[model samples]
Target: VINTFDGVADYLQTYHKLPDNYITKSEAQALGWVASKGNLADVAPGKSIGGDIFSNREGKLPGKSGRTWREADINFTSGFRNSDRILYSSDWLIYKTTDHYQTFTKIR
Candidate 1:
C-alpha cells in the first residue's frame, strides 16, 4: 500500500520534475502514518492532527508502551489566520487495498 502527505506534490514537481498527476513521496508517507495511527476522526481544533506511529515494530512491541511506527503530518496553512487573511483548506485522502494494491478502497 502507498500513503501520501502535503507538499509532496510540490516536492516532486520541484525536485524530480515528475508529471503533474504523479503522486509524491510525501503524500504516500502521510497516508501511511494516518493508517498506522488507526484514527482519523480526532483532528484538533484550529487545524491540527495527531496519530501514533506503527510502521516499524522494533520499538513498538506488541503490548509495550513504545510506538512501533512514526506519526507525522502537515499543519495549519499559516499557523494563524486574520480576518483579512484568506484561509486555504488542506485536503487529504486515505486509501487501502486488500488485493496487493491492484485496487484501492478510499478509507477517508
Candidate 2:
C-alpha cells in the first residue's frame, strides 16, 4: 500500500479494503453535507467517499466475467474535490479515471 494515488489503490487490494479514514459517500452525505457551508457538525468530518460498490453500468471499465468494481474518491479538501477517482474491482483490477469515467487508466 502506497501513499500516493496509485499506491492507495494498491493498498485497497492488498489489504482487502480502505483504511480507517474512509467512509461511504452516503455516510458522508448523511452528515448534512453543504459543500460551501461550515455546518458539517451534523455529518461526516474529514470524510471522503469509499466502501461502496461502483457499478460500471456504463462499461467504462474492462469487462471481465464475475467482476465488480468499488469506488473511492480523493482530494477532498475544504469542501471541494479535485477531479479523479481510484476504482478497484473484485477481480483485483485497479483503475483511475479523471474525466468522470470518460477515460480509464489501469493502475494495477
Q: What are the Cα lDDT values of the candidates?
A: 0.30, 0.70
**CA shift at 99, candidate 1, in angstroms?**
23
Which stretches in model 1 have alpha-carbon errors above 4 Å? 1-44, 56-67, 78-108
Give one digit per residue, the lDDT tens place, for model 1 in 43-97: 2222223232324333221232431322223322223211111111123223333
Worst-scoring 10-residue span by lDDT in model 2: 38-47
Query: Model 1: how large is the Cα RMSD against the reference?
Result: 15.4
Candidate 2 residue lDDT tens string, 1-108: 122466677687788878766777667667666657644433665556666888888887887888888877656534555567888888778888877677889888
User: What lDDT is obtained when candidate 1 is compared to the true structure?
Assistant: 0.30
